[PDB]
Structure formats: structure tokens, C-alpha cells
């Protein structure tokens, strides 16, 4: 009952009840008798590192490891990931990250869980370095972006023309020098947007005075 | 022999480091648990950094425009170097700036808009009404004194 | 017209009672359709993408899949998988449909106006060779399909064939606005003039 | 005489312009309080055309009237943008 909702809330992108409920499975799975408990205090123990990871706390990995149940009882491939991803995140290295799910690829693989909030993760990893970057530049070439973010030319290219979608800068990507201008300016006034409906007003009320001129005619 | 060391840092003119080392070099170099120690030999190494972390405040306040070229020069730095502590001091909330890659010029600046720029222009006007009416009351009073 | 359509089919997903009416994954198609000509990105993945009601139904025959794959496209900015899914909506989804056969002709072509001019929102510049070969094209095909859409306008796009980029004009700004007024100011200027000579008459 | 003066820059007060934030205020939220205005005055002249004059305004809002506060807020801030229009116009030429 709890590893289902734990999971779930996992998916909705709580990780502060994600980890409440899968340490409360944590308890029941490890210390009653084993026929796939085996199997499943290895799992929810992956799942409790990787919402720490989430958060951006990953002390709290390093507190939950040691040999006795993590390296000792449950000791997987899956447990030195989560400390790669861990280490990566907190860097900013969006480069270690990348070198780190290649090698623990078979892990990947094999649940969706993990495989779900690694692109989440890479996301958001992303957009965060992205920012530190183009906030106290504009005009900035995209090959000085890729080196610092760890990423091919091209691969930044491609991310910049969707953040301008989304608008969470609103600039332009200029491809035939290749720089960046990121335009935080407003393109609006109000005095425009509430004119816009104070005519519009008038052109319904003209319609209404129409009916009433009808006996004249 | 403390008062030359502070005396740079409270006022905001331009400083720049292969001269401020020199000076202080036979006199809190060589005092220890300044410059010069062991572990305050290391800080001698960033006493660089304060230098010119201080010289950009005054820069911004006063270029609104100015090559880059021209700022590695003041800093006493390379390119590379430069463009890292402007990065930075933006984060930091002491300045706002906006820096160019292809190596053109660096503009340091803090928004304004429309409505700002004509509260000023509204201001001016005020006063120089208030200037010529004073004017016009020592001229009254002239024709008392002659 | 279809503004009114995806209002009322989007939430003929939720709920459903059918007396001689057509088939749930028959509605279901529908909606996407509607959807899709509608709404824009942020609206749009939240409504046909995200349906707890869709995402239940999974597609099983040829019409609702082909109809899908092209909605996520859009969305995703995929554009190379997007004309092979734009071209099995033609056939399979437009045409065969009695209420879309007559409009087969204008929502095609409207979508090819907007995955462009979606491209063109996040551009000031972009090479010619580089934006064909995303869509699978040819430049001197482009070029010609560019210059059936732009007069008419919904790109907001010029080509300067000579320096061998596609140049994007911006004019959104406080200029945007000001034509916006000015027009649905011009229809108020006759309208008053119409009616009024018509009473100083009597 | 004694009583009908006031300073000697009050003689020399239309030259003293406002804050441009002040006045945006004031384009603001005329245009804004109107289109409320407007929607109230739409609601009246949907019915309001049966008999008894008195019956007809009580009944679908011609008390209170909106036509007649709709062209007067209309008016009291259109007399006053002729004059900033030409307060900014003499001050930008004459000073300079």
C-alpha cells in the first residue's frame, strides 16, 4: 500500500512525501522474511536516493549509504548511480551526468522510475547552468555556452530554440553569427490591452442601438 | 603605516595592483598576520583579487560605455580573467552588466525606463522656475543698495 | 469554423451518453483535430496530450494513431517526423470524414503555416540549407512554399536570397498594439458615420 | 485684491508640469474603470422599451443611471489630457 503511493506521489513530483512513504516501505521490506523482499528493499532503497537528489540535497544520499544495508545487504550497480547523478547535480556538471548514466546504462534500462525523473533531471540541470551563463551576457557566442554546460555545439542550439518557446527568457537565437540576445523587455502597456475591449464594448453597444432606430426607418 | 592601506579602499578612484604591491611590500609584507606569513603568503595572492573587484564599482558608476580591450588594461588583467569577475559581481547584486564574447565593448548599466527618465525631466523644469524667481527679488533689492 | 468545435468536443471527452451518436474513438479523433487547430503549445499539452480520457483509449487503428503522433510533434519540435505524420492525416484522418472533407484542403495548409512560423518565433536568423534539411526538403522548394504563405502573413518572415539566410522581422513590441486599435477603431469610425446619416435623413 | 492673490507662482503654475508616473496613472485608470461602466450600460438598453417610463428605469437599472456617469468620466478625462498634450509641447520648445 505504501510503495504504490510512493511511487506515485513520486511521479507527481512531491519528493518530500516520495520519501516518507518508500522509508516506511523501507522498514517493512527489509526486516520481514524474503521471496522478492529481496528484490523489492533493493528497489525502494534506489528510489529513496534518488528523491533527495531531486530536492538538491545530497548529503542526505551520503547519510543513507553506509555498509550495513547499502553496501552491505542491498548492493547493487544501481547504488553507485545514484551517487554519480548525486555528485553531478550538486556540481552543475551536466558533463558528469552524462558519462555517469552511460556506464550505469544497464540500471537505466531496467525501470521506468529512474529513467522517467533522469529526464526530468536533465531538464531541469540544463536550464539552471544555462541561466548562470546568458544572465550577465547578451551578444554571446554558442560555442562559449557548450563548453561550460558540457554540451555539443549543436545540442545547445537545439535546447535554446525551446526555452525561447517555453519563456523563460524570450530572446531570439541569431544562427547566422551564432549569438544569443536574451530580451527580458515588456512588449506590452496596459493602457493598449484595456483599450483594446473599451472599443470593443462600443461595437456591441452600436449593434443594440441599431434595434431600436429600426422604428424611424 | 595603516592609515596609507585603508585610505585607498575608502575613497573610489581608480587603483591598480603592480603599484599598490610595490608600495606596501617593505612594510606589511613583511609584518606577519597581514601579508607574508605562511598562510597570509597566500593572501598576498588575494589582495589581487580586491583590487579589482573595487576598481569595477567605480568603473560602472562611471563609463556607461567602455571597450573591453580597454578594461583589461585597467584591471591588470587578460580577457579570460576579465570576464569571469564581471560574471560573478553581477550575481552579486553591486553592479548590473551586460558583457559581449566576440570582444567588443562592455557595457555597465541599470535599467530605466520611460516613465523614470521624464520623472527627472519633470524635476529640472520645477527647479529652474524656483531659480529665476529668487532672481528677480536681489535685482528689486539692488535698486535699494544703489 | 471550428473555435466553437474544440470547445465542446474537449470536454466530450470527459463524459459521454450516446443515442444514436458516433462512437466513442470515432469522438475521440475529432477532438484531436479540433485541438490542434485551436490552442497553442501550453494550452495544447495540457488539453491533448495530457487527457487522463486519452492517454486511457490508446490508439489501436490507423486514424486516432496517425492523428496522435502529429499533435506530439507539434508540441515537441520534431519537425523532421512531422511531414510524414502531416501527410498520413491527409489521407486517413481529413478526407474520409464527412465534416472535414470541405476543410481538409485549409487545415492542411494552415498546418504547415504554423510549425514554420513556430520555428521562426525562436529565430532572428537561420540559413536556408539548415531549415530544409530539418523538414526533409530541398531549399528551392522551400523557397517556393514560403512564397505562397508569407503575403497573406502568418510567418512574419522575409528571405534574403542573396546573403543565403531566412531574416525574421519582429514586429511585436508597443507597435504590434497600436495596429491592433487602430483597425478595430476604423470599423466603429463607419459604422457610427452609417447609421447616423440614415437618422439625420428622417 | 488683497484677498484674491495668492503666491507669486501660482500666476506661473501651469508651467509646473507633473510626473510623467503620476499622469500614466491617470490614462490608466480612466480607460479601465470605463469598460466596467460600459458593461453595466449595455445590460440597461437590452429591455427597457415596454411602457411607463419611471417603471422601465426601476426595473432594469436606469436608476443609477451609467449613461449619463459613463460621459462624464468620459469627458472630465478628456479635458484634462488637452492640456498635458499642451503643457509638454510648450516646455520641450520655449526652454530649449
Same mark, same amino acid.
Given at each position: ?6 511511487i506515485?506521489?513520486?511521479e507527481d513530483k512531491?519528493y518530500?512525501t516520495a ?23 533493493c ?13 538538491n540535497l545530497?548529503?542526505?544520499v551520503?547519510? +543513507?549509504?553506509?555498509? #550495513?544495508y547499502?553496501k552491505?545487504?542491498? $548492493?547493487?550497480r544501481?547504488?553507485?548511480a ?5 555528485? &553531478?547535480?550538486?556540481?552543475? /556538471?551536466?558533463?558528469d ?19 522517467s ?8 540541470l540544463?536550464e ?11 551578444c554571446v557566442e ?9 554540451l ?7 535546447k535554446? *530554440?525551446?526555452?525561447?518557446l517555453?519563456k523563460?527568457?524570450?530572446?531570439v ?14 512588449? !506590452?502597456?496596459?493602457t493598449?490591452?484595456?483599450a ?7 461595437n ?9 432606430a429600426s422604428?424611424?426607418? | 603605516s ?7 579602499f575608502?575613497?573610489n ?16 609584507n613583511?609584518?606577519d598576520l597581514?601579508?607574508?606569513?605562511? &598562510?597570509?603568503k597566500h593572501?598576498?595572492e588575494?589582495? $589581487?583579487?580586491?583590487v579589482?573587484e ?9 563609463y ?5 580591450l580597454?578594461l583589461?588594461?585597467?584591471l591588470?588583467?587578460?580577457e579570460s580573467?576579465?570576464e ?5 559581481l553581477?550575481n ?13 565593448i ?5 535599467? #530605466? ?7 527627472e525631466? /519633470? ?7 524656483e ?10 533689492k ?5 | 469554423?471550428?473555435?466553437? @468545435? ?19 474513438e470515432?469522438? @475521440? ?6 485541438g490542434?487547430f485551436?490552442?497553442?503549445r501550453?494550452?495544447?499539452? /495540457?488539453?491533448?496530450?495530457?487527457s487522463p480520457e486519452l ?10 494513431? *496517425?492523428?496522435?503522433?502529429?499533435t +506530439? ?15 498520413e492525416?491527409? @489521407?486517413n484522418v ?17 498546418m ?17 540549407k539548415?531549415?530544409? /534539411?530539418?523538414f526533409?526538403?530541398?531549399v528551392?522548394?522551400?523557397?517556393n ?8 502573413? !502568418? ?8 546573403n543565403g ?15 491592433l486599435?487602430?483597425? !478595430? ?12 446619416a ?5 | ?8 507662482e501660482?500666476?506661473?503654475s ?10 500614466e496613472?491617470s490614462?490608466?485608470?480612466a480607460t479601465?474603470?470605463?469598460v466596467?461602466?460600459?458593461?453595466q ?5 437590452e ?7 419611471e417603471?422601465?428605469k426601476?426595473?432594469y ?12 468620466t ?10 498635458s498634450?499642451?503643457? @509638454? ?6 526652454i530649449?
Open positions: 500500500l505504501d510503495l504504490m503511493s510512493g506515485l506521489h513520486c512531491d518530500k520519501f516518507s512513504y518508500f522509508f516506511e516501505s523501507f522498514e517493512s521490506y527489509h526486516n520481514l522474511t524474503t521471496h522478492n523482499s529481496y528484490e523489492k528493499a528497489q525502494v532503497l534506489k528510489y529513496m536516493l534518488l528523491s533527495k537528489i531531486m530536492l545530497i548529503d542526505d551520503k547519510n +543513507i549509504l553506509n555498509a #550495513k547499502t552491505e545487504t542491498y $548492493q547493487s544501481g547504488i553507485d545514484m551517487k554519480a547523478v548525486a555528485e &553531478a547535480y550538486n556540481n552543475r /556538471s551536466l558533463l551526468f552524462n558519462t555517469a548514466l552511460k556506464q550505469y546504462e544497464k540500471e537505466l534500462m531496467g525501470d521506468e522510475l529512474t529513467r525523473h533522469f529526464n526530468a533531471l536533465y531538464d531541469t540544463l539552471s547552468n544555462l541561466c548562470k551563463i546568458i544572465e550577465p551576457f547578451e554558442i560555442s562559449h555556452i557548450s563548453k561550460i554546460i558540457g555539443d555545439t549543436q545540442q545547445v542550439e537545439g535554446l *530554440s525551446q526555452m525561447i517555453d523563460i527568457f524570450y530572446g537565437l541569431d544562427q547566422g553569427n551564432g549569438w544569443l540576445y536574451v530580451y527580458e523587455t515588456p512588449n !506590452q502597456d496596459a493598449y490591452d484595456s483594446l475591449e473599451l472599443v470593443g464594448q462600443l456591441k453597444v452600436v449593434d443594440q442601438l441599431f434595434e431600436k422604428v424611424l426607418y | 595603516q592609515e596609507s592601506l585603508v585610505k585607498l575608502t575613497t578612484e581608480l587603483m591598480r595592483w603592480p603599484i599598490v604591491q610595490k608600495t606596501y611590500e617593505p612594510v606589511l613583511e609584518d597581514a601579508f607574508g606569513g605562511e &598562510a597570509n593572501h598576498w588575494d589582495l $589581487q583579487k580586491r579589482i573595487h576598481n569595477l564599482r567605480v568603473i560602472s558608476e562611471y556607461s560605455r567602455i571597450t573591453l580597454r583589461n588594461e585597467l591588470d588583467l587578460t580573467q576579465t569571469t569577475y564581471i560574471s560573478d553581477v552579486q547584486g553591486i553592479i548590473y552588466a551586460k558583457v559581449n564574447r566576440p570582444a567588443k562592455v557595457n555597465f548599466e541599470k535599467p #530605466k525606463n520611460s516613465s523614470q527618465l521624464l520623472n525631466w /519633470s524635476h529640472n523644469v520645477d527647479e529652474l522656475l531659480h529665476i524667481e529668487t532672481i528677480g527679488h536681489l535685482i528689486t539692488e535698486e535699494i543698495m544703489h | 469554423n471550428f473555435k466553437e @468545435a474544440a470547445k465542446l468536443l474537449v470536454d466530450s471527452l470527459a463524459t459521454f451518453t450516446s443515442i444514436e451518436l458516433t462512437s466513442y470515432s469522438i @475521440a479523433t475529432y477532438a484531436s483535430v479540433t490542434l485551436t490552442l497553442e501550453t494550452d495544447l499539452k /495540457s488539453k491533448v496530450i495530457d492517454l486511457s483509449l490508446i490508439s489501436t487503428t490507423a486514424a486516432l494513431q *496517425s492523428i496522435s503522433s502529429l +506530439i510533434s507539434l508540441y515537441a519540435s520534431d519537425y523532421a517526423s512531422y511531414f510524414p505524420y502531416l501527410l492525416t491527409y @489521407a481529413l478526407i474520409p470524414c464527412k465534416y472535414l472533407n470541405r476543410h481538409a484542403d485549409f487545415f492542411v495548409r494552415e504547415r503555416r504554423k510549425v514554420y512560423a513556430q520555428l521562426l518565433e525562436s529565430y532572428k536568423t537561420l540559413s536556408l539548415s531549415m530544409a /534539411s530539418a526533409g526538403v530541398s528551392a522548394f522551400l523557397d512554399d514560403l512564397g505562397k504563405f508569407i503575403p497573406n502573413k !502568418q510567418l512574419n518572415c522575409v528571405i534574403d536570397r542573396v539566410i531566412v531574416e525574421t522581422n519582429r514586429p511585436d513590441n508597443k507597435n504590434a498594439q497600436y495596429h486599435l487602430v483597425k !478595430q477603431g476604423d470599423g466603429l469610425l463607419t459604422k457610427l458615420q452609417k447609421y447616423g440614415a437618422v439625420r435623413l428622417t | 485684491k488683497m484677498l484674491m492673490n495668492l503666491h507669486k501660482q500666476w506661473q501651469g508651467l509646473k508640469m507633473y510626473d510623467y508616473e503620476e499622469k496613472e490614462n490608466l485608470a479601465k474603470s470605463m466596467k461602466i460600459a458593461e450600460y449595455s445590460k440597461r438598453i429591455e427597457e422599451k415596454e411602457l411607463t417610463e417603471e422601465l426601476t426595473r437599472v436606469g436608476r443609477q443611471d451609467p449613461k449619463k456617469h459613463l460621459s462624464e468620459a469627458d472630465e478625462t478628456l479635458e484634462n489630457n488637452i492640456v498634450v499642451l503643457t @509638454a509641447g510648450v516646455n520641450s520648445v520655449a530649449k
